[PDB]
Ligand binder design. Structure first.
Ligand SMILES: [Ca+2]
Length: 134
């Protein structure tokens, strides 16, 4: 019914070593037996190019955090905000912006997972920027 990520600062951009924290906010219309809510956070640097007829792709993992949040099976009900809290630290040193500069893309985000027994996990995704503290 409603499944957002929301960071403590809605307008913040983060640098190296800083801690991204926020909430996961859920709303059900019907009554729901949720298995669990989770989170994957990723800092990936892609760069893609041609090479004759080849397409090459070269990746870099700067960030990769997985958490199961809390508030071990839950009865969600309508008219409440089931809020789940999460937080981690981006690495020290480079965070991607300037992988090999310009043409090298950085890609930061938080995904929220919702699991229910018999039910295909739902997702929701929110981007966030980082600045190189470099
Ligand atoms: Ca946990």
């Amino acid at each position: 019914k409603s499944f957002e990520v929301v960071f403590n600062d809605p307008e913040k951009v983060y640098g190296s070593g800083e801690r991204v924290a926020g909430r996961v906010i859920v709303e059900v219309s019907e009554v729901t037996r949720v298995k669990a809510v989770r989170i994957l956070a990723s800092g990936v640097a892609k760069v893609l190019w041609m090479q004759g007829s080849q397409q090459c792709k070269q990746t870099s993992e700067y960030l990769r955090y997985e958490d199961t949040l809390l508030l071990e099976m839950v009865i969600m009900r309508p008219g409440n905000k089931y809020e789940y809290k999460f937080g981690f630290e981006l690495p020290q040193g480079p965070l991607g912006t300037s992988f090999k500069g310009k043409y090298g893309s950085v890609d930061y985000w938080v995904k929220a997972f919702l699991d229910r027994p018999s039910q295909p996990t739902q997702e929701t995704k929110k981007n966030f920027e980082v600045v190189d503290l470099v």
